[PDB]
Amino acid sequence: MERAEILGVGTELLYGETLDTNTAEIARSLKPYALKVERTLRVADEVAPLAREVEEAFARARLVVLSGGLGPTPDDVTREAVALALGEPLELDEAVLGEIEAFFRARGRAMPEANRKQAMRIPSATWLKNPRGTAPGWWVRKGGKDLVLLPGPPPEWRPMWQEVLPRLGLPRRPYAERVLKTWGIGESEIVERLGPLFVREEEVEVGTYPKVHGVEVVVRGREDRVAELAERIKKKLLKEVWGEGEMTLAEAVKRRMEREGATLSTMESLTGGLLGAEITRVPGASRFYLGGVVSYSVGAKARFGVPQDLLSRTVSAETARAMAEAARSLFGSTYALATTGVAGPDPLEGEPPGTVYVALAGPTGAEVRRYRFPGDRETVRLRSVYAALALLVT
Amino acid sequence: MERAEILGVGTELLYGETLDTNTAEIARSLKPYALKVERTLRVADEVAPLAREVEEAFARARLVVLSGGLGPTPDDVTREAVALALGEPLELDEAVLGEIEAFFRARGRAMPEANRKQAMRIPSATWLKNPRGTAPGWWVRKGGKDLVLLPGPPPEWRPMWQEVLPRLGLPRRPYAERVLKTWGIGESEIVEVEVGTYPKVHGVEVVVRGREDRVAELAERIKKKLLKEVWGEGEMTLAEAVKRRMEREGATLSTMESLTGGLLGAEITRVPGASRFYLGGVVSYSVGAKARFGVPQDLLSRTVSAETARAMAEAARSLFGSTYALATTGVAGPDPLEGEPPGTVYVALAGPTGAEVRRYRFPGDRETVRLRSVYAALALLVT
Ligand SMILES: Nc1ncnc2c1ncn2[C@@H]1O[C@H](COP(=O)(O)O)[C@@H](O)[C@H]1O
Ligand code: NA
């Protein structure tokens, strides 16, 4: 399987002064094609290094897609670099220059001399029309290979790319991907439960991505092999998979509440409101979520019903259950979730950072789960939120 | 000027399933040093290609920094690829294994076989300790060059990187950045070494950057020109400004929130030491909850109003007995409410001398309006 190389041009992309979403979007557009994307580059606006990267990319690939640096400034050097990389000279296309002149004239302005540059193409390039911008793109076919220059701005390049992509004659491959979202199982256990199902092959592959909301397992590749291998994987992880594709834990909790005709409330310590924030992120939350309290001080804990006998061990399963039952009674909700524990950086009640209890109380009783989360303060906070949400969708 | 090469490892990065901020962040951290950054890479999780890219980056660079693929799975292959690229074998280090085992034991777990691979290193490598996981990093000093392997999650590598970066012995250059954080004034009106303005949910930042001498002089004159609009600098956040006021006065704080849903309480408590002043809050997300915690009946049908914001602030302050109390109410989106558009927001502060309310009309989607609402509330106390 041959390579596609993707290069976003622009010094600002290197430093994140412009966020490079171009190279990823292009990469995702290549999914239906039997090409391998091994890497993406972001390259500075400098002719020699850029020329070097293009030549190398071209030498190893069936397709090279470049984005950006097609402006009129001295910092816009992509055309020169491609020219240098492929050993062809730039040529003024008088006709294109007229269209560039027209662009400015339509806006009541003479064409700046700088913009003359934008009507240069090498002999191997045909033009790609940009009715949205001054810079027309290129399509270079050479050596049985394709190279495509696109302007930076997405609204300029997206229609251009959509048009030319099916014209390149890239080989197709029926492609699928499956995303499984788990909770409460770490990477190593997934490894063990999967064993040989954790495939890494040219036709299909299985990857894991640990998030604050749990480990995502993605199977991707040939449609046939993805379908059956992802179903096997789902079987092995059945009780820990709470969602697929776009599903979020918040949205999952919402579906359950709506299915049941049930309501929810919360009582939070260490997460400080972040669980309510996350529940209320999804439009339509007011249909089930009655509200909540943040019991950050000892006095607030007492005020909202934590028993006095537990105020010296608020970081406990006992307190967590009491908090959840208290919220349920206080809000009159069908369900209630509680969070208590040690965010970091310091210990609390002699317990170390990451020590977290989450609880759910409902019509048939209450239940508690204990966690020792690694990570800094903000990480521990976030995991606690998802841990609490996970009690409802297990 | 020698090169710095920077690779983020992760197939999910190529596709932007997770957006690569690591390589950019590391690049910015390198500005005070006399190294050239010509390109950055994202590489798929595959040993052969990854080893090729590492071999090539190391050949051409004074410094190579890799971020990602130090988990225990068959899709974590950065250690193997670096070992391949540098021609060295992976060797299990008994001591680090003992630490990994202890890490799991404290969590009440037996150490899984798979994690053993994480205590593996090449002879030329030194460990960079990871008090935040079981994957510690590497620092290879070899032929006068440096290669640093870092874990992927920023909460994890940042402290490792902050710590190792001065130890690398890179040549310095006098570069600096000063960030001035304003509230309640647009870019345009601000308009009226290099200076830039960056609109954020917490207000417009004015960044001055370039040669440290020039940066410091010019940014003091910019701070002069915007004296009354600047609420903080550098790392300062509104929540931390609020914390400094509460501490100075020995005062307390509480909140009652509707549209923000708990995000204001979240943001206040993000800052360590928040429990010295923050007593707690109510998320009054239903009419029943508003009533029960002290909002008058007469106001319950009209939530998008200055009167409601006032009453919530007062209700919270009475409920918790705090010196000050903040409230948020209004329309997050995507739907209008009470004939008011998304982004119509009232924030309130109740304190010893009474209450004040500010109305905003915020652009942005639901999450953006929530966030700006949080900062608008905090800003009542510190602007
Ligand atoms: N790799 C990229 N990803 C996302 N947006 C980009 C990229 N490169 C350029 N842009 C956008 O297009 C603009 C650059 O304009 P130009 O100088 O005409 O390429 C930037 O200001 C961004 O708005
Ligand atoms: Na109990």
Short mmCIF file of C-alpha atoms in Angstrom, two decimals, chain A residues 166-297:
data_model
loop_
_atom_site.label_atom_id
_atom_site.label_comp_id
_atom_site.label_asym_id
_atom_site.label_seq_id
_atom_site.Cartn_x
_atom_site.Cartn_y
_atom_site.Cartn_z
CA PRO A 166 -11.97 12.03 -7.11
CA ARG A 167 -10.02 13.03 -10.28
CA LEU A 168 -6.63 11.76 -9.07
CA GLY A 169 -7.46 8.11 -9.73
CA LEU A 170 -6.29 7.02 -6.28
CA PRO A 171 -6.95 3.40 -5.51
CA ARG A 172 -10.09 2.87 -3.43
CA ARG A 173 -10.54 0.52 -0.49
CA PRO A 174 -13.85 0.04 1.32
CA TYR A 175 -13.08 1.54 4.68
CA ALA A 176 -14.73 1.35 8.07
CA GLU A 177 -13.94 2.36 11.63
CA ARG A 178 -15.52 1.51 14.96
CA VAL A 179 -15.00 3.49 18.14
CA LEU A 180 -15.84 1.78 21.45
CA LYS A 181 -15.90 3.87 24.59
CA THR A 182 -15.16 2.01 27.83
CA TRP A 183 -15.04 2.84 31.51
CA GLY A 184 -13.31 1.31 34.47
CA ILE A 185 -10.74 -0.85 32.64
CA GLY A 186 -7.19 0.27 32.07
CA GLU A 187 -4.93 -0.27 29.04
CA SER A 188 -3.15 -3.37 30.33
CA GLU A 189 -6.37 -5.26 31.11
CA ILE A 190 -7.71 -4.44 27.66
CA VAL A 191 -4.44 -5.90 26.29
CA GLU A 192 -4.93 -9.12 28.29
CA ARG A 193 -8.63 -9.46 27.53
CA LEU A 194 -7.98 -8.93 23.83
CA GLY A 195 -4.74 -10.90 23.43
CA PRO A 196 -4.53 -11.78 19.67
CA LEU A 197 -7.55 -9.55 18.90
CA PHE A 198 -5.32 -6.54 19.49
CA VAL A 199 -4.35 -6.70 15.79
CA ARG A 200 -1.85 -4.42 14.10
CA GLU A 201 -1.76 -5.32 10.39
CA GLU A 202 -1.87 -3.65 7.01
CA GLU A 203 -5.56 -4.55 6.28
CA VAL A 204 -6.93 -3.62 9.75
CA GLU A 205 -5.81 -2.26 13.10
CA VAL A 206 -6.88 -1.86 16.72
CA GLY A 207 -5.73 1.13 18.81
CA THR A 208 -6.33 2.35 22.39
CA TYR A 209 -6.61 5.94 23.58
CA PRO A 210 -6.79 6.58 27.34
CA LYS A 211 -9.02 9.55 28.18
CA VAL A 212 -10.23 11.18 31.40
CA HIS A 213 -13.58 9.62 30.38
CA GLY A 214 -11.98 6.20 29.99
CA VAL A 215 -10.17 4.15 27.35
CA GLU A 216 -11.42 4.43 23.77
CA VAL A 217 -10.77 1.42 21.55
CA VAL A 218 -10.78 2.17 17.81
CA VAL A 219 -10.77 -0.51 15.11
CA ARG A 220 -10.07 0.87 11.59
CA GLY A 221 -9.39 -0.42 8.03
CA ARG A 222 -11.01 -2.78 5.54
CA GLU A 223 -14.75 -2.72 6.09
CA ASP A 224 -15.06 -6.53 6.35
CA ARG A 225 -12.20 -7.03 8.81
CA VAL A 226 -13.24 -4.04 10.92
CA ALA A 227 -16.85 -5.24 11.31
CA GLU A 228 -16.04 -8.72 12.61
CA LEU A 229 -12.97 -7.87 14.63
CA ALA A 230 -14.76 -4.91 16.35
CA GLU A 231 -17.75 -7.15 17.19
CA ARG A 232 -15.35 -9.72 18.77
CA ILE A 233 -13.74 -6.88 20.68
CA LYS A 234 -17.08 -5.51 21.85
CA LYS A 235 -17.96 -9.01 23.20
CA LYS A 236 -14.80 -9.13 25.31
CA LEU A 237 -15.43 -5.68 26.72
CA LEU A 238 -19.22 -5.90 26.95
CA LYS A 239 -19.75 -4.70 30.49
CA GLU A 240 -17.23 -1.80 30.20
CA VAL A 241 -18.47 -0.37 26.86
CA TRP A 242 -20.88 2.46 27.63
CA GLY A 243 -21.07 3.99 24.14
CA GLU A 244 -19.95 4.01 20.51
CA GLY A 245 -19.01 6.60 17.90
CA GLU A 246 -20.06 10.06 19.03
CA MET A 247 -21.77 9.08 22.30
CA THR A 248 -20.64 11.01 25.39
CA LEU A 249 -21.07 9.97 29.06
CA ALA A 250 -23.29 13.04 29.56
CA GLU A 251 -25.49 12.08 26.57
CA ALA A 252 -25.59 8.48 27.77
CA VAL A 253 -26.81 9.58 31.22
CA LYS A 254 -29.43 11.76 29.43
CA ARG A 255 -30.74 8.74 27.39
CA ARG A 256 -31.19 6.67 30.52
CA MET A 257 -33.00 9.44 32.40
CA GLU A 258 -35.33 10.03 29.41
CA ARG A 259 -35.93 6.26 28.86
CA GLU A 260 -36.94 5.93 32.51
CA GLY A 261 -38.80 9.24 32.88
CA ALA A 262 -36.42 9.89 35.79
CA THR A 263 -34.80 12.95 37.35
CA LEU A 264 -31.28 13.58 38.69
CA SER A 265 -29.44 15.79 41.14
CA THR A 266 -25.94 16.04 42.56
CA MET A 267 -23.83 16.80 45.63
CA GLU A 268 -20.15 17.60 44.99
CA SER A 269 -17.07 18.18 47.05
CA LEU A 270 -13.67 17.95 45.23
CA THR A 271 -15.14 18.42 41.74
CA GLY A 272 -16.53 21.78 42.86
CA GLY A 273 -19.43 21.95 40.33
CA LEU A 274 -17.67 20.26 37.43
CA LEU A 275 -20.10 17.28 37.52
CA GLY A 276 -23.11 19.60 37.18
CA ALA A 277 -21.27 21.50 34.44
CA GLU A 278 -20.68 18.29 32.52
CA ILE A 279 -24.27 17.02 32.94
CA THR A 280 -25.63 20.41 31.79
CA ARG A 281 -23.25 20.58 28.77
CA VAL A 282 -25.85 18.75 26.61
CA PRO A 283 -28.85 20.77 25.37
CA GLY A 284 -32.05 19.40 26.90
CA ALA A 285 -30.45 18.66 30.32
CA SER A 286 -33.23 20.60 32.15
CA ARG A 287 -35.69 17.84 31.19
CA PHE A 288 -34.07 15.57 33.94
CA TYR A 289 -31.46 17.50 35.92
CA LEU A 290 -33.11 19.30 38.91
CA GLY A 291 -29.85 20.87 40.06
CA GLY A 292 -27.23 20.25 42.70
CA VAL A 293 -25.07 21.61 45.51
CA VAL A 294 -21.39 22.11 45.88
CA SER A 295 -20.56 21.40 49.46
CA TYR A 296 -17.04 22.72 49.55
CA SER A 297 -16.72 23.75 53.19
#
